[PDB]
């Protein structure tokens, strides 16, 4: 019989839940009611970037705080110079249904993917100076939701077939495959050491993986809807999740428990993208109500809103040096807020 | 500022290429194909392919009718769940929905999928072209008897053929009665929400009717005309 295994599973689970509860004695709200509040912070659209024909579905910041890449469902991948709003590259895509974009941490490669189930890697630097498709990765039985360049030769992707995988560009293999999710893995983020990454799926849960090891380390619950996006605290010990239930949450790795939840009654639309600031004090979250809100990472107060978009905000990313934040929305516009 | 001048020239070249691509992108209409496994949408896409990868995931069928260049996307190897990726097709000319009228057992399931597609938040303004495919099998089933569609839907006998019906010559009253019953079953959900933002265009495609492209062209022409009239506040 296997019913005994089924009941002991939840038994060995509830024991985990009560151990987590025992390890929890105080909330962040009580501890944080000492510091001076951040207060109202106003951000203005320093630069707007136009040229995309259709909605913008993803973006990434280059590792130089200057170059920007953005993918839109018109089939065009555009690389901007955020300082001068000059279109450096206008790479056209094979399939127009692109759902994710990435920038290599070297400035030489640019990745993309989407409903075509293929992660395409473009070589920015070439002998003739023309952008070419360096490699195409296949093996995902579902739409590609997110991809992050772990290295110049290694890339980790998360697709809608409840799996995440680690790929090698020079062979297009699947040396490591991360399974365990029970829904479409919507987003993932790498820790700032290229050692562990987290991935939020549609099963209202997040998991911590290990690129070197290959299996999930811990998993986090607490959400009641699909996790639309995920981020990572700069220290590497915490990460913030945004879900369709209009509530953001903070989790800690070593604590292995839910820390505190960001929410408000006025807002009702779900999250689309989250991103921490350089100091880890500001948490910027996108929304379907056409504006993104920045909340203090500790006291959970609406410091301000970046209300400047005419349609749903889909992508949002804080620069590597923290000098600026850029949001791309479905109105085919990118804005640089400071 | 020579490097700045070179960068500006490169940006100008890229912008001109972007305008050239924008003209073509705005000059074509994008359609999304939806339906169950036993809906015949594969046969429809195959016939309109000639009328004009392993994993795949998405497909394409560029057919041209009177120089309009419709793009027709059929979803391939994707998981059963479709709540998330359907947001990509929130700005398309129309959504083509194909239903197997003969299959009574899964008819209700097709009804719920059509209802969910109609009531989706991100497809509120997207019109739907309805293709009640496999009409010949539906025709032969009722004459052959031993079907009893009334058990699945306890409303057939309390129903009469609408006066709007225009049956083809030399066809039985029972077959057109059943056809219009199914069409009105879909139209009941069609005319229950959306006000005047998106509509449903039902058609009776038999198996291989070559006029499917013409029907799609006419429906898209109606949709664009309605949109333009709405922009001018006339409609």
């Amino acid at each position: 019989e296997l019913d005994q295994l089924r009941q002991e599973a939840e038994q060995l689970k509830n024991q985990i839940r009560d151990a987590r509860k025992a390890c929890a004695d105080a909330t962040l709200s009580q501890i944080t009611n000492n510091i001076d509040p951040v207060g109202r912070i106003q951000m203005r659209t320093r630069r707007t970037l136009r040229g995309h024909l259709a909605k913008i579905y993803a973006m990434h910041w280059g590792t130089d705080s200057r170059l920007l890449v953005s993918a839109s469902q018109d089939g065009k991948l555009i690389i901007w110079d955020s300082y001068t709003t000059n279109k450096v590259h206008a790479i056209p895509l094979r399939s127009s249904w692109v759902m994710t974009c990435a920038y290599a941490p070297s400035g030489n490669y640019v990745a993309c993917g989407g409903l075509d189930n293929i992660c395409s890697i473009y070589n920015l630097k070439t002998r003739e100076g023309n952008v070419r498709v360096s490699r195409e990765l296949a093996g995902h039985t579902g739409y590609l939701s997110c991809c992050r360049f772990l290295d110049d030769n290694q890339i980790v992707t998360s697709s809608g077939d409840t799996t995440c995988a680690l790929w090698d560009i020079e062979t297009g293999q699947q040396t490591t495959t991360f399974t365990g999710h029970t829904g479409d893995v919507m987003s993932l983020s790498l820790a700032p050491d290229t050692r562990l990454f987290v991935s939020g799926a549609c099963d209202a849960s997040a998991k911590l993986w290990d690129v070197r090891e290959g299996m999930c380390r811990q998993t986090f619950t607490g959400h009641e809807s699909d996790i639309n996006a995920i981020c990572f605290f700069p220290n590497g010990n915490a990460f913030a999740t945004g879900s369709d239930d209009a509530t953001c949450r903070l989790f800690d790795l070593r604590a292995d428990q839910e820390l505190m939840t960001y929410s408000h009654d006025n807002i009702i639309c779900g999250i689309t993208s989250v991103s921490f600031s350089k100091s880890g004090r500001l948490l910027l979250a996108g929304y379907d109500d056409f504006n993104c809100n920045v909340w203090d990472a500790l006291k959970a107060d609406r410091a301000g809103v970046l209300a400047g978009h005419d349609n749903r905000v889909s992508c949002l990313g804080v620069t590597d040096d923290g000098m600026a934040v850029a949001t791309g929305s479905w109105d085919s516009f990118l804005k640089i807020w400071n | 500022s020579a490097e700045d001048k070179a960068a500006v020239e490169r940006s100008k070249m890229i912008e001109k290429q972007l305008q050239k691509d924008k003209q073509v992108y705005r000059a074509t209409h994008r359609l999304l194909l939806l339906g169950a496994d036993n809906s015949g949408k594969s046969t429809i896409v195959k016939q309109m392919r000639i009328y004009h990868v392993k994993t795949s995931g998405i497909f394409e069928t560029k057919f041209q009718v009177d120089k309009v260049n419709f793009h027709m996307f059929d979803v391939g190897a994707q998981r059963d769940e479709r709540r998330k990726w359907i947001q990509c097709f929130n700005d398309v000319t129309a959504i083509i929905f194909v239903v197997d009228s003969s299959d009574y057992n899964r008819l209700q399931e097709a009804l719920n999928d059509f209802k969910s597609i109609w009531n989706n938040r991100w497809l509120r303004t997207i019109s739907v072209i309805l293709f009640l495919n496999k009409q010949d099998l539906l025709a032969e089933k009722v004459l052959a008897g031993k079907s009893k569609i009334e058990d699945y839907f306890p409303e057939f006998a309390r129903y009469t053929t609408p006066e709007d019906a225009t049956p083809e010559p030399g066809e039985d009253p029972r077959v057109t009665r059943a056809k219009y019953f199914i069409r009105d079953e879909f139209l009941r959900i069609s005319t229950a929400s959306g006000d005047g933002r998106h509509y449903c265009y039902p058609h009776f495609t038999c198996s291989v009717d070559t006029e499917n492209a013409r029907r799609i062209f006419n429906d898209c022409r109606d949709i664009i005309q309605r949109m333009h009239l709405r922009q001018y506040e006339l409609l």
Partner: nanobody, 124 residues
């Protein structure tokens, strides 16, 4: 955590009555749309009924139209399904699925083979 449990079911003579109680925890039960999905043996999952978040918009399948009734208890975060006049073809496993998006009418993928927000189910 999203947890759904079902109570009731069993084996009864044809034409009898059965009561199904669904217990939901881990989310605000008063801000969601709950659906009933049944799967007959040797057959795929079939949608049965849906209840709106306000308890007004209620629909059923034509197979059990006018015979199956539903009840929702937002205060207790529980759902009660009452059935009468059991038919020989009504034997199936019933799951009290939940629509994914809160504060909305539509909900996709309720009848999925591997839907995340679905309970284990009770055989009837």
């Amino acid at each position: 955590q999203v947890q759904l449990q079902e109570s009731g079911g069993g084996l009864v003579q044809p034409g009898g009555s059965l009561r199904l109680s669904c217990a939901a925890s881990g989310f605000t039960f008063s801000n969601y749309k709950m659906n009933w999905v049944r799967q007959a043996p040797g057959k795929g999952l079939e949608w049965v009924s849906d209840i709106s978040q306000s308890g007004a918009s209620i629909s059923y399948t034509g197979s059990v139209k006018g015979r199956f009734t539903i009840s929702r208890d937002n205060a207790k975060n529980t759902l009660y399904l009452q059935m009468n006049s059991l038919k020989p073809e009504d034997t199936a496993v019933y799951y009290c699925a939940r629509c994914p998006a809160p504060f909305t009418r539509d909900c996709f993928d309720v009848t999925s083979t591997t839907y995340a927000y679905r309970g284990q189910g009770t055989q009837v």
